Write a protein that binds this DNA or RNA. Structure first.
Lengths: 74, 150, 120, 127
RNA sequence: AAAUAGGCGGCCGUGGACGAGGGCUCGGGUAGAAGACCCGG
RNA sequence: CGGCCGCCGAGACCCCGGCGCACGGAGUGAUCGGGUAGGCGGGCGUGCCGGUGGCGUAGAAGCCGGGCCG
RNA sequence: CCGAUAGCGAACUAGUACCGUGAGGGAAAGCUGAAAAGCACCCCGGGAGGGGGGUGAAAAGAGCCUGAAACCGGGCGGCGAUAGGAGGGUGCGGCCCGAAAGGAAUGAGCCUCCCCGAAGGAAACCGCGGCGACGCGGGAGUACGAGGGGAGGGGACCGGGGUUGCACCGUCCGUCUUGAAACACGGGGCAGGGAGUUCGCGGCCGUGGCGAGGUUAAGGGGGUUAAGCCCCGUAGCCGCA
RNA sequence: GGACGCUAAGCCGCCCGGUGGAUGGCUCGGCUCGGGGCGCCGACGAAGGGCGUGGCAAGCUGCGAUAAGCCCCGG
């Protein structure tokens, strides 16, 4: 109906198309790294999350019982 | 077609040449020089060039050729091949002209003009295991003569 | 899409109708009701029948610019004209209200509005 | 004519002329287009974008002609391609002009022109 | 070819009439890369 | 250098109409009009499909050159 | 879905030609016309080439349907051997043509009169001042003014195109850059090719259905030539704490 | 003095002929999908490959010196 190309048009001679410079768009370094890109990591490779809180961590605990002994009532 | 219109069996005589292996540059100088003369005069002009006693000036190209005796521009050459080739056309034009009922010995050359045809191409070696184009250009050239008028 | 425009014609016929009333009798309510309809579907009224029973002045004319959503309790006698009713809902205003009627026959009830309160 | 004021203004516009409608250099480069077919400025060296002196008027909103002149030929008549006898109906010498197409056979065309003169419709050329 | 493009003296004109100057030609150079220049015919 | 006087001289500023935008319903704006990065919104063109309605040797498309409109 | 510088490398003697010790690498080349009637016979040409004439169309006459641009030759129109260039833009002259699609002959460029009339706003001469330059009063917001309206005269170009002179202005294009006309980078010229796509998941939004519920997946039955649409299936998910 | 009295070479536009192979129409080909089939064969000497073979044969295709083929049955 609409396509991505339709929305870009052929544009202003931006030659990037909504991501500013054409030198920060050439690969995966540009993203800051591929995937999540460390969290509990000692380097601050990804420093700050995607929310303002910086970074939010994982590896806290509390047991789950075996599925057979549990019941969550209805 | 022909490049200039012909009323061939009653006011013109024509001939044309196809795929003559001859320089374009040399064709330009001859066509330009022969135009406006009579057929007889054209015969005369060719016969002196072939003897190598009448240079035809280049006035359409001018590069890398000395100057020649007296008047007109210095650069010029003897287009021997071209002069021999056109002579054959002239003989044909005349012969056609006898059949048609035209006088064969008074026609003036209104129009003569030369055309860059296909290019016969190939290779000759140059250094470093490289091959370079070795070409001869093939030219078509037309001639149209028209009867005297006043 | 990702930009407004209703494609239900019935809605559009109704929004045009509100405007004619607004210029001619020069009153405010119909003009307010048309804007509410113009707002998104998720910004269209969602009115519960227990929420009718909890808030509303008895005996008066309720206008709802969305859908009325039943399987509750109601016993408050108010007469509702609205853009949509649920099937369940529609039975309940006949039997514990005034009655269910469409929002387009309210033109007939008050041609310029008296005593009517918009309920979001 | 159409009007006196309209006849002046269309003449004033033709004579003045509107932009080139091909940005910068085109005599020198057939690489860049034909004098039709305006391309948006895509330079950073673009003297035309800045609105330089000695390089011409830039296409702007302003250049738009009066509504009467716009969307029509300047004698106010609205063009209809007519390929057949049925299409011809519902034209009027009051606001329409008719265009005969190249394609049209002579047999249908005899019928198109004869009805068209009867209608009072003005035509490209005689008949 | 100083465009303030100069001066003097002499020579000339007046497809489809007639044709003054001039070259190409020839024999050699005082001349000379081509050409030019010069001289004899 | 210190006074003084008359003029020249911008897309400014003024002024007439037109045009867009904003606002007004199912004319109004002293307090509207530059524009890269970037966001937003509208239209055109291209191939094929489907539906609908037409055209062709009494001359299609394409090509070339010219006119006209936006 | 694609269509012969595309889709298989390959639509046509192709994994052929071809290269490399080998392993292995790897192209290009589609189209006469209804029927070949694929040109007898004749002139010329050393000539088998080509030309003249006869060849339904031959501008279908032999990789021949159509036949673009760059480019080459001649010609036409303009300019041109004492005068200056990012090659032009805008105004105004010259020369050049213009059958058509434009506007106008039911009146074109053009000319003339009358009037309205924005912003603006003189002159002659007079008077009085000022060292004078010149100001002030009256003339006078007048004369005058863009633009518009109406009427009239004339009767075929005008627009528009080609080129060129004059006045004025004008240091390409794209990218890089804080700054580009650049001694920063890239471009011989033209044509063709040539770069935002699919899937999953998450977060947004618009529309639409239904509603305290909503939605069915897989499958077979069914229907049909097949199939989609139509009905069954609620497995299972989500919300209702 | 100014005048077209002769301004060649050349510049620009257009025109005509050639060059070139783009463009449109054309397609006995690709490509993808759905259904069904094929679903093994060989020392009882396979597949694959080579070289010949046709009146004229350059390649391809088909065959094996019984050489673009031979025989039998049914259609």
């Amino acid at each position: 109906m609409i396509r991505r190309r339709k929305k870009v048009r052929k544009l202003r001679g931006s030659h990037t198309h909504g991501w500013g410079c054409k030198k920060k768009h050439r690969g995966g370094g540009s993203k800051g790294g591929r995937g999540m890109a460390g969290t509990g990591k000692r380097n601050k490779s990804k420093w700050t999350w995607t929310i303002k809180y910086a970074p939010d961590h994982l590896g806290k605990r509390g047991f789950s019982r075996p599925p057979e002994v549990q019941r969550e009532v209805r | 077609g022909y490049s200039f219109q012909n009323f061939d069996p009653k006011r013109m005589a024509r001939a044309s040449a196809r795929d003559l292996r001859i320089s374009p540059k040399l064709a330009v100088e001859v066509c330009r020089e022969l135009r406006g003369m009579m057929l007889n005069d054209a015969l005369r002009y060719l016969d002196d060039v072939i003897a190598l006693k009448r240079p035809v000036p280049l006035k359409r190209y001018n590069d890398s050729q000395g100057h020649k005796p007296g008047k007109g521009f210095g650069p010029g050459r003897y287009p021997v091949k071209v002069a021999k080739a056109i002579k054959k056309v002239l003989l044909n034009v005349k012969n056609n002209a006898v059949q048609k009922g035209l006088d064969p010995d008074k026609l003036k050359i209104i129009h003569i003009a030369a055309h860059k045809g296909p290019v016969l191409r190939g290779w000759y070696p140059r250094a470093f295991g490289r091959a370079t184009p070795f070409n001869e250009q093939t030219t078509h050239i037309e001639v149209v003569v028209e009867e005297i008028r006043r | 899409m990702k930009r407004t425009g209703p494609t239900d014609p019935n809605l559009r016929r109704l929004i045009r109708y509100l405007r004619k009333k607004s210029n001619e009798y020069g009153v405010k309510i119909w003009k307010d009701v048309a804007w509410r309809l113009e707002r998104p579907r998720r910004q269209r009224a969602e009115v519960n029948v227990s929420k009718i029973n909890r808030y509303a002045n008895d005996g008066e004319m309720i206008v709802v610019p969305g859908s009325v959503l039943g399987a509750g309790k109601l016993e408050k006698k108010v007469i509702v004209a609205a853009w949509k009713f649920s099937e369940t809902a529609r039975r309940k205003i006949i039997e514990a209200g005034g009655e269910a009627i469409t929002i387009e026959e309210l033109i007939e009830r008050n041609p310029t509005g008296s005593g009517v309160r918009i309920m979001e | 004519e159409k009007e006196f004021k309209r006849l002046l203004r269309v003449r004033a516009r033709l004579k003045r002329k509107k932009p080139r409608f091909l940005r910068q250099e085109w005599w020198r480069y057939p690489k860049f287009k034909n004098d039709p077919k305006w391309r948006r400025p895509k330079g950073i060296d673009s003297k035309m974008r800045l609105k330089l002196k000695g390089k011409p008027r830039s296409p702007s909103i302003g250049w738009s002609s009066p509504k009467l002149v716009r969307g029509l030929h300047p004698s106010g008549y609205e063009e209809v391609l007519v390929h057949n006898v049925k299409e011809l109906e519902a034209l009027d010498p009051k606001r329409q002009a008719a265009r005969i197409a190249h394609t049209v056979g002579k047999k249908k065309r005899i019928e198109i022109i004869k009805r068209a003169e009867e209608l009072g419709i003005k035509v490209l050329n005689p008949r």
